Each structure stands twice: as C-alpha cells, then as structure tokens.
Amino acid sequence: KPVVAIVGRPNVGKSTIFNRIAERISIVEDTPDRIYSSAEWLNYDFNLIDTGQIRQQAEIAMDEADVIIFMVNGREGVTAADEEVAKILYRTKKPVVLAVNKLDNMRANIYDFYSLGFGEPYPISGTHGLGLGDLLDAVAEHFKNIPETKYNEEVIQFCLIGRPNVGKSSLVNAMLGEERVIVAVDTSFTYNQQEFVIVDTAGMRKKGKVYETTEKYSVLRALKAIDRSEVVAVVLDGEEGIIEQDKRIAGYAHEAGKAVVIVVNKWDAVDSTMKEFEENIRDHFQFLDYAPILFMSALTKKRIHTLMPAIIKASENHSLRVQTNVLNDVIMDAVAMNPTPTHNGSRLKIYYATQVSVKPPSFVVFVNDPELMHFSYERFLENRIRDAFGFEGTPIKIFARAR
Ligand SMILES: Nc1nc2c(ncn2[C@@H]2O[C@H](COP(=O)(O)OP(=O)(O)O)[C@@H](O)[C@H]2O)c(=O)[nH]1
Structure with missing residues (x-):
C-alpha cells in the first residue's frame, strides 16, 4: 500500500535504481499510470512511481507519494542544478531521504551533502547495488508514520x-x-x-x-x-x-x-x-x-x-525552514559569546550545523565528541536559534554527530 518516489535532477542514476527495487500494475485496485509494486523478493512492500523544469516531477511526486527519495550524483558532487530541486522539495510535509549515487560509505565524508538539508546521505554504487539496504531501511521506517487518512499537502x-x-x-x-x-x-x-x-x-x-x-x-x-x-x-x-x-x-x-x-x-x-x-x-x-x-x-x-x-x-x-549559511552565523555567534565547556583539557568543538527535518524543525550540530555536548549547551543553542527566527509555537530538536 505505501508509495515511494525517486526524485532528483536527470542523469543521476534515478532510472538505474528504479530497476533494483522495481513488476508493473495495470487493471487492479488502486488510488493512482506507470505504478509498480515493490520488487516482490524484497523484505517489504510498497508502490514505486514514474513521475510523468523538474518542478513538475517534484510536485506530482509529493502529490501522490508519502515517502520521497531525492537522489543526487556523488561522482562530481552537489550540483548547482541540484540545490534548486531541494528548494522545490522544501515545500512538503512528507518525509524525504537523501540518495547519493556512486560512493563508498570513505568517499562519503562530505558536509556539502548535509547542507542540502534532508539529513544523512545514503550512498549507493548503483551498478553493484551497495549501501542500499540502509536506504530502504531509512525509507521503510516512515511507513510506520504514514497515516491511513490523507489530504492535499496544502491542507x-x-x-x-x-x-x-x-x-x-x-x-x-x-x-x-x-x-x-x-x-x-x-x-x-x-x-x-x-x-x-x-x-x-x-x-x-x-x-x-x-x-x-x-x-x-x-x-x-x-x-x-x-x-x-x-x-x-x-x-x-x-x-x-x-x-x-x-x-x-x-x-x-x-x-x-x-x-x-x-x-x-x-x-x-x-x-x-x-x-x-x-x-x-x-x-x-x-x-x-x-x-x-x-x-x-x-x-x-x-x-x-x-x-x-x-x-x-x-x-x-x-x-519554517532555515538557510544553512545564516544558521551557522548564528552558531558561530553562539560560541564567541559563551565559550564551550572544559572537561579538563578535552573541550567541545562545533564544526558545522545544518537543518535536516521539519514537523518539527530539527538541526544537527557537527562536533569533536557528541557526549561532550552536555544538554546545557544544547539548550543554549536552542534558545539562541529561537531569538533569531522566532519558532514561537513549535518544538525543535537538536541532535549532534561526530564529524
Ligand atoms: N452550570 C454548569 N455548567 C457546566 C458545568 N460544566 C460544564 N457546563 C456547561 O457545559 C458546557 C461544556 O463544554 P463543552 O464544550 O461541551 O466541553 P467538552 O464536553 O469537553 O467538549 C459548558 O459550556 C457549560 O455551559 C458545571 O459544572 N456547571
């Protein structure tokens, strides 16, 4: 029953990966052309979807699919063309996952892909079908939060x-x-x-x-x-x-x-x-x-x-979705005010921060050691962020990961 949409600008392996996790449907019960159920063998079930300037895909996709996989190409990085697709896909309350084609999870160690701002990259060699089990693991979870009742996104x-x-x-x-x-x-x-x-x-x-x-x-x-x-x-x-x-x-x-x-x-x-x-x-x-x-x-x-x-x-x-560039100005501003804690020698360092989720908005802070960020500083940042773009009405969470 669930519905999944591969998206991204063209010539990134979208068409390749589709065949990995592909039979087609025709004259069987449905809420819809060119739908497929999941590649029968696979662990779980759900429907795939062909979506037919890329604004047309992005909308038609997030019209009809409750989990969306946005796929860039990591052969030559986060293309100018890509950042506009992300910019289109920022207008959706549905989940989004970040497929990065042709990489070693190694060649994956790139803050550029976090910037795009849909959470962690999931690399996928495409021809060998590596790193994919994790992708469908990161997708399938969202099936557990899809409501059986659905409305237009602008509802x-x-x-x-x-x-x-x-x-x-x-x-x-x-x-x-x-x-x-x-x-x-x-x-x-x-x-x-x-x-x-x-x-x-x-x-x-x-x-x-x-x-x-x-x-x-x-x-x-x-x-x-x-x-x-x-x-x-x-x-x-x-x-x-x-x-x-x-x-x-x-x-x-x-x-x-x-x-x-x-x-x-x-x-x-x-x-x-x-x-x-x-x-x-x-x-x-x-x-x-x-x-x-x-x-x-x-x-x-x-x-x-x-x-x-x-x-x-x-x-x-x-x-409400914040610009990665501004946000970090805010964060760099945070420390210049209040220096990070001492753990007798070992001090906390904040390399880079970025948005990843919404409903509710969520930020990752990249650091030297996650447990060194004590909750006290975590909130200080939270309070700083709110004095910047308000966020008055909503909760926001602040995770933190090793660089
Ligand atoms: N006189 C009196 N009226 C009450 C009392 N409790 C509730 N009511 C009336 O009943 C209404 C209850 O509100 P309602 O909107 O139905 O709340 P809900 O039942 O939780 O949806 C109120 O507007 C009051 O006029 C009470 O202790 N005394």
Missing part, C-alpha cells in the same frame, strides 16, 4: 484535545460561527479561503450519543488524533485549571514533536489573575514555553478570533 490538520466539559465542543463552533470561516470523520472547513481540518471531530459527535466509557478510551482516542494533527490545541478549563490528564495528553505532543497552543476557555466565567495563572501554567507546563497562552471565551466569544491566527503562526513555524 492543514489540527486538534482540540483536553479533559471533559472544558470547552472542546462549545469552542469549535464559536470559531465556525465567525464570518472569516466557511463551513468524513472530521470537519473540513476553510478560513480566508484556505482548507482546514479539525482531526477526529467525532471527539464531539460521539461523546453526546454515547455514555462516557472511561478515561482510557477517550485519551487513546485523543492521542490517535494527535498522531495525525500538525498543531495541537491544549484547551484548559479556566475555572477548574491544572491536572493529570491535561498535562498527560499535552506532554505527548512535545514527545510526538507537535506544534502546541494553550487555550484557556471559560474565561468569561472568571472574576493579576492572568499572570499568576500564566506562571501557574508555565510552572506546571515548563516544557511548553515556546507555545503561547490564549485567554479566550467560547461562551461570550471573548477573543474568539485570537485563535486561527495563532494556529497559522504555529503551523507556519512547525514547517
């Missing part, structure tokens, strides 16, 4: 999670009632003529034809939605306040690496009370600090509009 998916009676049902409509908004297990609406989807909106429709089973099945119901949403809205109870489950479902988002927002509903029904309740939230949600605290009301529409904007802001950042 934006989100959810209103929390404990019961807090506002979830009331508050969804108040938004839909606004004139900017224009009205299937989910609600598929538009705002400013742009598609939107509140994921599992039967979190409302089910609970009122059905006596409330128990905490377990509803939370699970919610965490399953979170797996499909890009922005979560953790929507509290303004009278009642903090607890277990709010935190529990809200902690899963950060641990899923999800764009979070903190809505405080039933604020009409509240009599300094903000900033004491804010730092009360920031105490008990001291990981969610990037995410903004909204003090709206569903019942009286108070600040109801302070919402879809904040989502778009969070959704925009969750995707």
